[PDB]
mmCIF file of C-alpha atoms and ligand atoms in Angstrom:
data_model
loop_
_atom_site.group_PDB
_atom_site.id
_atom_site.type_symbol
_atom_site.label_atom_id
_atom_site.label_comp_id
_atom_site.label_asym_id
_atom_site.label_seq_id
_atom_site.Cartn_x
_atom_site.Cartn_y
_atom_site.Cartn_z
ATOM 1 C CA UNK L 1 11.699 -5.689 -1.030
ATOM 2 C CA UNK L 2 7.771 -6.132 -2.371
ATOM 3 C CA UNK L 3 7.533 -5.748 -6.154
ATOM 4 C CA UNK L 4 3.832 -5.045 -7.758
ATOM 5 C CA UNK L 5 5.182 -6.960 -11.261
ATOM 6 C CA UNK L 6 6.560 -10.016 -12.454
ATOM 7 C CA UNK L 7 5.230 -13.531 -10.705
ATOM 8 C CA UNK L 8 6.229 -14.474 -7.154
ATOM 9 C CA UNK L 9 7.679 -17.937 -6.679
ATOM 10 C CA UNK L 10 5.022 -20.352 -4.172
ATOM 11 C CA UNK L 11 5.408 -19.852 -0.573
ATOM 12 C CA UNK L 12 7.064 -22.707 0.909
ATOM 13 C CA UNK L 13 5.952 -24.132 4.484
ATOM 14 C CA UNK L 14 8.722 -22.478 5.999
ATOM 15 C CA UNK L 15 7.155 -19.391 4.836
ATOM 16 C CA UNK L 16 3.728 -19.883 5.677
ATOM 17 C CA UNK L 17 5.094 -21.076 8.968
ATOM 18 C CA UNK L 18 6.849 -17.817 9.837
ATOM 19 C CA UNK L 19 4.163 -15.699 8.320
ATOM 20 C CA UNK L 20 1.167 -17.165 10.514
ATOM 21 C CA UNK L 21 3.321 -16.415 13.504
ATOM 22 C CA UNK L 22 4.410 -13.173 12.961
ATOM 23 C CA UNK L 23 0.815 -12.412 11.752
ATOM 24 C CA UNK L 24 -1.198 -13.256 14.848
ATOM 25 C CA UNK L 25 0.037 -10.389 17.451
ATOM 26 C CA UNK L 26 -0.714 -8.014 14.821
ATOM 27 C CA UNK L 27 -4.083 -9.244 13.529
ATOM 28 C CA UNK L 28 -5.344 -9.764 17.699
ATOM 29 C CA UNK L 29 -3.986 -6.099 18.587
ATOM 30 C CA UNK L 30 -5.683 -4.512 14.911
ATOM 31 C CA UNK L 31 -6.816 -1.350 17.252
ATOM 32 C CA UNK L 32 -3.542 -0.755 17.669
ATOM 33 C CA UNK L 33 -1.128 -1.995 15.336
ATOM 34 C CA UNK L 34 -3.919 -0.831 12.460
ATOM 35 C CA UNK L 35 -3.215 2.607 13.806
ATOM 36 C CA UNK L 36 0.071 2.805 13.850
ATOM 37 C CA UNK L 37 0.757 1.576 10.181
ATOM 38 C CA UNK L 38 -1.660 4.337 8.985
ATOM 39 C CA UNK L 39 0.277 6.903 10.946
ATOM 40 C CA UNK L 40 3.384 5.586 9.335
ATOM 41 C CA UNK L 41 2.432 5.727 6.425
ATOM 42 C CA UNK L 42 0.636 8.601 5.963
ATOM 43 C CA UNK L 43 3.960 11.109 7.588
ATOM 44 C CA UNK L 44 6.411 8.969 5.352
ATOM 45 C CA UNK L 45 4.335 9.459 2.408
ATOM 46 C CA UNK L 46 1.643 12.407 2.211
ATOM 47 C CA UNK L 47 0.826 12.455 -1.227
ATOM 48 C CA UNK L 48 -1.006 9.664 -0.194
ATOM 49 C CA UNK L 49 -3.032 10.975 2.212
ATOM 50 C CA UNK L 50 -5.426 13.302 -0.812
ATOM 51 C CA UNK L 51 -6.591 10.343 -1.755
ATOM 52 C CA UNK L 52 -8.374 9.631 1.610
ATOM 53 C CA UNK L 53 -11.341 12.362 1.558
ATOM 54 C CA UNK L 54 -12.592 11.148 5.326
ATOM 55 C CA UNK L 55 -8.890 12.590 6.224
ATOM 56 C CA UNK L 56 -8.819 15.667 5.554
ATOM 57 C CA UNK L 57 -8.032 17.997 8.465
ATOM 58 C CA UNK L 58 -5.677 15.785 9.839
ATOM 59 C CA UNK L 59 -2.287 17.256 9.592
ATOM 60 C CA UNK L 60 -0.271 15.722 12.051
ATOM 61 C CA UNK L 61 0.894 12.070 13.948
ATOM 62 C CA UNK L 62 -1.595 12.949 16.969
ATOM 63 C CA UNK L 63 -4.353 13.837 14.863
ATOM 64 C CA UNK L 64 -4.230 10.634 12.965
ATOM 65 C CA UNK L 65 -3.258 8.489 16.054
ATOM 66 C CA UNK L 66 -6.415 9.383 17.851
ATOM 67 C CA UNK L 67 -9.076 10.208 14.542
ATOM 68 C CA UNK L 68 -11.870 7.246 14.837
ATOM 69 C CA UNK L 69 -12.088 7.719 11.300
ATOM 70 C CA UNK L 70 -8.440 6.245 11.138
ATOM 71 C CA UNK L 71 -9.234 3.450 13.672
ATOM 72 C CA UNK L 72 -11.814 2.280 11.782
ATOM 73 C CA UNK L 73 -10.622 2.544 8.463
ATOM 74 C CA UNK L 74 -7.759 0.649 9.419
ATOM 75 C CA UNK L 75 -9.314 -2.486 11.162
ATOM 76 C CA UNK L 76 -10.990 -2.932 7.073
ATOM 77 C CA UNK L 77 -7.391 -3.074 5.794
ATOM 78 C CA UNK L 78 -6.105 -5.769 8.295
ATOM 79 C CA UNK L 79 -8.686 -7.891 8.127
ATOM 80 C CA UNK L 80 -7.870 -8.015 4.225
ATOM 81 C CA UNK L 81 -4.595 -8.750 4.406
ATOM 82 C CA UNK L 82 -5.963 -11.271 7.817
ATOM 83 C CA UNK L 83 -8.243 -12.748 4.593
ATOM 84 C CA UNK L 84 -4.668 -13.481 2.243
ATOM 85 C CA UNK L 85 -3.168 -15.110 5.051
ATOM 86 C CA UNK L 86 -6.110 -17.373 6.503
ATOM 87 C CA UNK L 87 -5.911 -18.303 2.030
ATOM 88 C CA UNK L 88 -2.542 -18.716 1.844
ATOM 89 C CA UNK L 89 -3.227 -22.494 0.858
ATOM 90 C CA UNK L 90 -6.189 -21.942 -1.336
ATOM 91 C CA UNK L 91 -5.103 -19.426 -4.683
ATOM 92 C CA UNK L 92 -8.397 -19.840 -5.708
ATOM 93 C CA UNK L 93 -9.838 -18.259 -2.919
ATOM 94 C CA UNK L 94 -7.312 -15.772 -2.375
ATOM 95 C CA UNK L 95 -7.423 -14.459 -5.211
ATOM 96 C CA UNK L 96 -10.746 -14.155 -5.895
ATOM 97 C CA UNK L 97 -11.143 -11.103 -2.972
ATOM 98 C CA UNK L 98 -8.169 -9.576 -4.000
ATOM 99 C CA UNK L 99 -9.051 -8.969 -7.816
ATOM 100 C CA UNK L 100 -12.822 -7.931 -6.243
ATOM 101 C CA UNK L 101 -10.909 -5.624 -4.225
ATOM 102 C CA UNK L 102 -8.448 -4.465 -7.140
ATOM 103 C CA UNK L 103 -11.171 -3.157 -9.075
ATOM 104 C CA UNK L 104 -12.847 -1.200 -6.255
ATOM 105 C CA UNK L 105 -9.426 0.706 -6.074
ATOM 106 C CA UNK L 106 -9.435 1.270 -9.747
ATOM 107 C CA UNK L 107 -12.963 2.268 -10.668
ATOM 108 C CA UNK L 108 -14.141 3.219 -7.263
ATOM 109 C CA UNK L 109 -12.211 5.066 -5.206
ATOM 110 C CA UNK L 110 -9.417 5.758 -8.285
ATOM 111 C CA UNK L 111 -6.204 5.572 -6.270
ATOM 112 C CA UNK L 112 -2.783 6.264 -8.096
ATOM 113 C CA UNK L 113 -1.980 2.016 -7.667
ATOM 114 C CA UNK L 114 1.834 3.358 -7.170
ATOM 115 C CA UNK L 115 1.106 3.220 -3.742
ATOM 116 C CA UNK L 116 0.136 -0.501 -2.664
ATOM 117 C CA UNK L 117 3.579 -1.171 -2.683
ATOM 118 C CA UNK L 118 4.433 1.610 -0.015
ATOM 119 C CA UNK L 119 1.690 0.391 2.219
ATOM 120 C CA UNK L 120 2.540 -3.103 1.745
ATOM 121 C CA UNK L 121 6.058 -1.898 2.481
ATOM 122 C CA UNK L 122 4.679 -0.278 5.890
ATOM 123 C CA UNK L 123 2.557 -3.822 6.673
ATOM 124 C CA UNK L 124 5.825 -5.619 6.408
ATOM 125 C CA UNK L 125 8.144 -3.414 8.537
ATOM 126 C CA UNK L 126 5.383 -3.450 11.702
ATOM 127 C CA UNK L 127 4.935 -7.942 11.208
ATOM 128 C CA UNK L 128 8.556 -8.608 10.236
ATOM 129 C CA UNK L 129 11.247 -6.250 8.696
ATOM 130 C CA UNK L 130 13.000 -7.730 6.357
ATOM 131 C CA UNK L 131 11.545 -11.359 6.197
ATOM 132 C CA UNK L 132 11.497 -12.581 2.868
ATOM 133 C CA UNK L 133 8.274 -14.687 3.111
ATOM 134 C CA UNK L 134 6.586 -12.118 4.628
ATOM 135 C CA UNK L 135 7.738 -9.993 1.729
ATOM 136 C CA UNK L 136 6.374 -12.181 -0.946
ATOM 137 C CA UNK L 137 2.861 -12.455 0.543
ATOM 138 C CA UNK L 138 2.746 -8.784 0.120
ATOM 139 C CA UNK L 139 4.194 -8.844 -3.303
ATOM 140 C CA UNK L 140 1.550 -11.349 -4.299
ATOM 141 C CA UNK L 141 -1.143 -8.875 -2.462
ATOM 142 C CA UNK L 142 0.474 -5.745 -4.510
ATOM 143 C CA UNK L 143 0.300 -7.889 -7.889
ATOM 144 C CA UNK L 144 -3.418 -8.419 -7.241
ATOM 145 C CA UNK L 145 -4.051 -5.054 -6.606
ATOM 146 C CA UNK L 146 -2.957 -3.842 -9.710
ATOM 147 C CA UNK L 147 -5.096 -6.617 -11.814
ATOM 148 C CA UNK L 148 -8.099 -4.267 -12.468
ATOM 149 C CA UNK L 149 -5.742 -1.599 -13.734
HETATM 150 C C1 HEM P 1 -1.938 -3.204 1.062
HETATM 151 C C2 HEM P 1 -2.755 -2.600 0.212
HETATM 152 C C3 HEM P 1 -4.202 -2.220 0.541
HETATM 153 C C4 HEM P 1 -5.202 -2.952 1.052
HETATM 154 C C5 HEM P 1 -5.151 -4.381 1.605
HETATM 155 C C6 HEM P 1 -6.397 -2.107 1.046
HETATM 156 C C7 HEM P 1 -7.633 -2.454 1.533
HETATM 157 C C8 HEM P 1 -8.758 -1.671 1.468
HETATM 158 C C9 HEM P 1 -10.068 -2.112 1.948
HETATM 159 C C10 HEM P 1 -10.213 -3.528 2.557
HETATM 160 C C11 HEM P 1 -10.929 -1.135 1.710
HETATM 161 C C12 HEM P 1 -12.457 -1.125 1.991
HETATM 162 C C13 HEM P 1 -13.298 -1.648 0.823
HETATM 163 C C14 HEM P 1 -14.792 -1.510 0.907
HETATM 164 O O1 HEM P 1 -15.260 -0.501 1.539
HETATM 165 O O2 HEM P 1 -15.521 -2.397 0.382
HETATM 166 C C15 HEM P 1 -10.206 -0.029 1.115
HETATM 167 C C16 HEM P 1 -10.714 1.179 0.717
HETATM 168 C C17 HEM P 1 -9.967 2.258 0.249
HETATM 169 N N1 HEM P 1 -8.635 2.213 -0.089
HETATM 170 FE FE1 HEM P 1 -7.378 0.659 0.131
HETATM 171 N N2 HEM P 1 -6.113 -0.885 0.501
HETATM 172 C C18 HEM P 1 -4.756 -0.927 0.171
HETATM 173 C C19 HEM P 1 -4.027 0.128 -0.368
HETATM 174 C C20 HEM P 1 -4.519 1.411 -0.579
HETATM 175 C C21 HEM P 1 -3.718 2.573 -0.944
HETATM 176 C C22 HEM P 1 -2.179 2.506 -1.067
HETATM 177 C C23 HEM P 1 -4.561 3.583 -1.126
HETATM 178 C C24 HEM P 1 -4.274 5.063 -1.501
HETATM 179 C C25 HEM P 1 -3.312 5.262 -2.427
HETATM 180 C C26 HEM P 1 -5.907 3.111 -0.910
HETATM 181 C C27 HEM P 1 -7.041 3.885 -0.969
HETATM 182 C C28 HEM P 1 -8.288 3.486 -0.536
HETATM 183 C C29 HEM P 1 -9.457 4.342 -0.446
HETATM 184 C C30 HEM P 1 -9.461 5.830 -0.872
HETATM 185 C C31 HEM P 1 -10.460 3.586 0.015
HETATM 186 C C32 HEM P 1 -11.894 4.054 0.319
HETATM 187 C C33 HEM P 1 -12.075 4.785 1.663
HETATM 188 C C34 HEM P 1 -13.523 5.049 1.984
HETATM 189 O O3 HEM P 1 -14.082 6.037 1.416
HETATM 190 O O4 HEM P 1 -14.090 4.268 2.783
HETATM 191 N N3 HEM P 1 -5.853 1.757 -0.556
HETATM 192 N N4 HEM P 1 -8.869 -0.386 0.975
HETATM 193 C C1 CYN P 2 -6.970 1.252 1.886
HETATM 194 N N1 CYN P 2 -6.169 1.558 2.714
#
């Protein structure tokens, strides 16, 4: 499961391997697949959707499944996660975007951080249920998050 605490343990190339593959038909259909995550995880988990002021009105699946707002929302949060994996290699860089984007969440947009890990969650069950290396890349991504916290 993905963890926001603790340290992850390095990726080996098996990993990465699996990871980069799984990736690719997601991050090429982001219209779509960016979509759907969004609508899952917005009717699993609807406290989360208060904190998403450029939602409000939509109240069901449909609604969310065909709002542009959604669409293009969405698109920003797979190319960051598109960022982590094209970084994968480099800490440094990865990193570096992820803390930048940590501290928007914190002292921009103030989101309750208890919820990167259900999103990440989401991300994972639409590239690869269950894979453990996908799992850790999302852990590392959930750490990050929480750094400006
Ligand atoms: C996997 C974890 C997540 C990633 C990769 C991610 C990524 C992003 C990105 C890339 C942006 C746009 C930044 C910008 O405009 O410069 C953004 C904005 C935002 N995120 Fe996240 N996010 C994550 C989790 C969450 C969660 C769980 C929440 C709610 C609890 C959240 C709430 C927001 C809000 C409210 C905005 C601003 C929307 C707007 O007014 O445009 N994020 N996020
Ligand atoms: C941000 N989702």
């Amino acid at each position: 499961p993905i963890v926001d605490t603790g340290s992850v343990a390095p990726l080996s190339a098996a990993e990465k391997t699996k990871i980069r593959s799984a990736w690719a038909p997601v991050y090429s259909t982001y219209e779509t697949s960016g979509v759907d995550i969004l609508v899952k995880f917005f009717t699993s988990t609807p406290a989360a959707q208060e904190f998403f002021p450029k939602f409000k009105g939509l109240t069901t699946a449909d609604e969310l499944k065909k709002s542009a707002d959604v669409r293009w929302h969405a698109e920003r949060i797979i190319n960051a996660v598109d960022d982590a994996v094209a970084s994968m290699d480099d800490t440094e860089k990865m990193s570096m975007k992820l803390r930048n984007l940590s501290g928007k969440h914190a002292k921009s947009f103030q989101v309750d951080p208890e919820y990167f890990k259900v999103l990440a969650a989401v991300i994972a069950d639409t590239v690869a249920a269950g894979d453990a290396g996908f799992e850790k890349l999302m852990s590392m991504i959930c750490i990050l998050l929480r750094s400006a916290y």
